[PDB]
Amino acid sequence: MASETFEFQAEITQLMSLIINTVYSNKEIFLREIVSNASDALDKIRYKSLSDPKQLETEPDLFIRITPKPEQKVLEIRDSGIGMTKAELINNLGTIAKSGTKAFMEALSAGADVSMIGQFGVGFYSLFLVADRVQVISKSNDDEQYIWESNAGGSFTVTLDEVNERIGRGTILRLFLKDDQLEYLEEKRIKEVIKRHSEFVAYPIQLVVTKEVE
Amino acid sequence: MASETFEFQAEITQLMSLIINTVYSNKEIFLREIVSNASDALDKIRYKSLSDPKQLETEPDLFIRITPKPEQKVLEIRDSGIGMTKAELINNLGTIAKSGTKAFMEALSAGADVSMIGQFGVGFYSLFLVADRVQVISKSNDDEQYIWESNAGGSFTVTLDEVNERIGRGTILRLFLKDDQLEYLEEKRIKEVIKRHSEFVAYPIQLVVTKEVE
Ligand SMILES: C[C@@H]1C[C@H]2O[C@@H]2/C=C\C=C\C(=O)Cc2c(Cl)c(O)cc(O)c2C(=O)O1
Ligand SMILES: C[C@@H]1C[C@H]2O[C@@H]2/C=C\C=C\C(=O)Cc2c(Cl)c(O)cc(O)c2C(=O)O1
């Protein structure tokens, strides 16, 4: 099952650099950006559902779900939103321009808080504060399940998904956390970051916790 | 990705019948049978590891993990034991004879408690007390990941797994619970059944719980 490799738009590889290179504070901010994107994706599928209700049937429950995977140093955030086809993954997550990119970098470099990233429409790339690699696993009603992957170098891959659990519909962000950032695998840390920045999220935010029976 | 279909040995389709037809009590007993098989499978990989340590490397953590999936009316029990190749799934779970089968049925039908099922070496089939369908997803170090599936009819299928999460090594039992048996999706119910019957399990028994942040 062969990967296809794509080059990032120039200003995205630029934006990526850094965000990872010039940040410093309010990085736990990566999580509000994630949840915000997930909420918007769920907004999209519910809106679409008003005129096309059967779009919901692939996954009738509307949720955002966070699953720490401490063994793998991974944090997953799943939504049952609209999902992205192969072409949408390629276009949304790296090959097309985003209007707000260069303006966010030129901004940042004059003291903008990075919380501002979302106002420019490039909030996805804030995950590189805590992660040195990401896979975005997505399933749209209009396509098969695919995996987009990036380690913040100049290329990304997209591969037909024959390896991950089936998502009925929606997207999983799979963050591979930096060795110094393992705190975001912690139940208390996660709830603390969520209550602060995602109060008026309209969807259930589920946390998956593993407990030894003893 | 095509399924292969196999016929069950006669006395297994017989044993299946019923267990599901003549049971009545101590059915929560299905869980001790599961955990017992999982413990034995973990016993096997650790024993094998003494002379072949690198067998462990595909999944270094030794655990039993129970994951309720209430949306799907599913209960999963995962172990990181030795796992089963395609041929082992076909042989272990339905095509070869098991020495203790007929003796367990002839026994049962004179008032044996069904807790006895394990002493005859056929404890796997106790899952049909609570489940009307099962998939066994398995990954041995010696083969690809495969899915065995049965709904207690006379045939089962085995399919190369291109749909479920990767298990490094081991087996997941995926139980599709009967509509009247949804209690076994409940955190309290599960811990209660585990403490009673699996005290001297030597491995961590992990319970995966989903909690809304609120
Ligand atoms: C295109 C769809 C629907 C859009 O409404 C969402 C708003 C912003 C999305 C930005 C993205 O780049 C894709 C995306 C990300 Cl990054 C995410 O973390 C979660 C998601 O569910 C989606 C998605 O599926 O986005
Ligand atoms: C053959 C291997 C190793 C054997 O030591 C285990 C003892 C009994 C197994 C009975 C089976 O039929 C397979 C099996 C079941 Cl049913 C299970 O619920 C969990 C498991 O991990 C295995 C397994 O992988 O079994």
Work out whether strand A64-69 and strand B64-69 pair parallel, antiparallel, or are unpaired: unpaired
Classify burial at A147, counting beta carbons within 10 Å of its beta carbon; exposed 0-12, middle 13-18, buried 19 or more. Answer: buried
What's the gap in Å between B48 CA and the centre of ligand 2?
Answer: 15
User: Residue B48 half-sphere exposure, CB side, CA atoms within 13 Å?
Assistant: 15
Q: So what CATH class is A1-214?
A: alpha beta
At what resolution in Å was this solved? 1.6
Cα B59–chain centre separation: 19
Structural biology method used: X-ray
Q: Which residues of A touch B162 (CB under 8 A)?
A: 162-163
3-state per-residue secondary structure call for B133-195: EEEEEEECCCCCCEEEEECCCCEEEEEECCCCCCCCCEEEEEEEECCCCHHHHCHHHHHHHHH
Reading the block at residue A199, the tokens are 């109060």
Contact B137, B174 (CB under 8 A): yes
Name the residue among A63, A163, A181, A179 with its Cα closest to residue B144.
Answer: A163
Q: List, in sequence order, every residue forming a beta bridge with B139; answer none if it has no partner.
A: B170
Length of chain A: 214
Ligand nearest to the CA of A136: 1
Residues closing a segment before a gap in chain A (C–N exceeding 2.5 Å):
18
What gap in Å lies between CA A89 and CA A145, rounded to an integer?
A: 11
Q: How many CB atoms lie within 10 A of CB A166?
A: 12
**Residue B13 region, left (φ>0) first, then alpha (ψ -120 to 50), else beta?**
alpha
Contact B68, B75 (CB under 8 A): yes
Name the residue among A161, A23, A148, A177 with its Cα closest to residue A87.
Answer: A148
What gap in Å lies between CA A201 and CA B10, rounded to an integer?
A: 56
Contact A197, A205 (CB under 8 A): no
What gap in Å lies between CA B183 and CA B131, rounded to an integer?
A: 12
Q: How many CB atoms lie within 10 A of CB B151?
A: 14
When CB atoms are compared, the residue of A165, A207, A212 closest to B213 is: A207
Contact A177, A75 (CB under 8 A): yes
Q: Is A84 annotated as a binding residue?
A: yes
What gap in Å lies between CA B197 and CA B187, rounded to an integer?
A: 16
3-state secondary structure of A68: strand
Those residues with Cβ within 8 angstroms of residue A192's Cβ, 6 or more apart along the chain or in another chain: none
Give the A window 148-167 contacts with B, CB below 8 Å. 162-166
Reading the block at residue B32, the tokens are 């001790």
Work out whether strand B64-69 and strand B155-160 pair parallel, antiparallel, or are unpaired: unpaired
Q: Is the dihedral of CA A174, A136, A25, A8 positive or negative?
A: positive
DSSP code at position B121 = T
What gap in Å lies between CA A61 and CA B12, rounded to an integer?
A: 38
Contact B161, B58 (CB under 8 A): no
Q: Is B128 annotated as a binding residue?
A: no
Cα A58–chain centre separation: 21
| Integer-rounded Cα radius of gyration of chain A | 17
What gap in Å lies between CA A48 and CA A169, rounded to an integer?
A: 14
When CB atoms are compared, the residue of B61, B195, B206 closest to A211 is: B206
| C-beta A76 within 6 A of ligand 1 | no
Query: Where are chain B's structural domains?
Result: 1-214
Reading the block at residue B18, the tokens are 């019923």
Reading the block at residue A103, the tokens are 């303006």
Reading the block at residue B14, the tokens are 């017989």
Which ligand 2 atom is the nearest neighbour of the CA of B171?
A: 21
| C-beta A171 within 6 A of ligand 1 | yes
Q: Which residue has the tokens 């920045």?
A: A197
Which ligand 2 atom is the nearest neighbour of the CA of B84?
A: 24
Backbone angles phi and psi of B179, in degrees to 5: -55, -25
What gap in Å lies between CA A194 and CA A31, rounded to an integer?
A: 8
Those residues with Cβ within 8 angstroms of residue A101's Cβ, 6 or more apart along the chain or in another chain: A9, A11, A12, A14, A15, A120, A122
3-state secondary structure of B78: strand
| C-beta A203 within 6 A of ligand 1 | no
Instruction: Compute, in degrees rounded to 10, the torsion defined by CA atoms A87, A12, A127, A100.
Output: -90
Q: How many CB atoms lie within 10 A of CB A24?
A: 8
3-state secondary structure of A162: coil
Name the residue among B117, B121, B140 with its Cα closest to residue B129.
Answer: B117
DSSP code at position B47 = H
Contact A208 B209 (CB under 8 A): yes
Q: Which residues of B touch A212 (CB under 8 A)?
A: 204-207
Contact B88, B140 (CB under 8 A): yes
Name the residue among A150, A184, A162, A160 with its Cα closest to residue A76.
Answer: A184
Name the residue among A177, A185, A153 with its Cα closest to residue A17.
Answer: A153
Name the residue among B185, B182, B198, B146 with its Cα closest to residue B167.
Answer: B146
What gap in Å lies between CA B10 and CA B154, rounded to an integer?
A: 9
Reading the block at residue A188, the tokens are 């208390």
Contact B130, B27 (CB under 8 A): yes
Q: Which residues does ligand 2 sit against, CB inside 6 Å? A: B 34, 37-38, 40-41, 44, 79, 81-84, 92-93, 124, 171, 173
Which ligand 2 atom is the nearest neighbour of the CA of B93?
A: 12
Q: CB distance from B121 to chain A under 8 Å?
A: no
What gap in Å lies between CA A41 and CA B96, rounded to an integer?
A: 50
What gap in Å lies between CA A32 and CA A197, rounded to an integer?
A: 6
Q: Which residues of A touch B194 (CB under 8 A)?
A: 213
DSSP code at position A121 = T
3-state secondary structure of B113: coil
DSSP code at position B96 = S
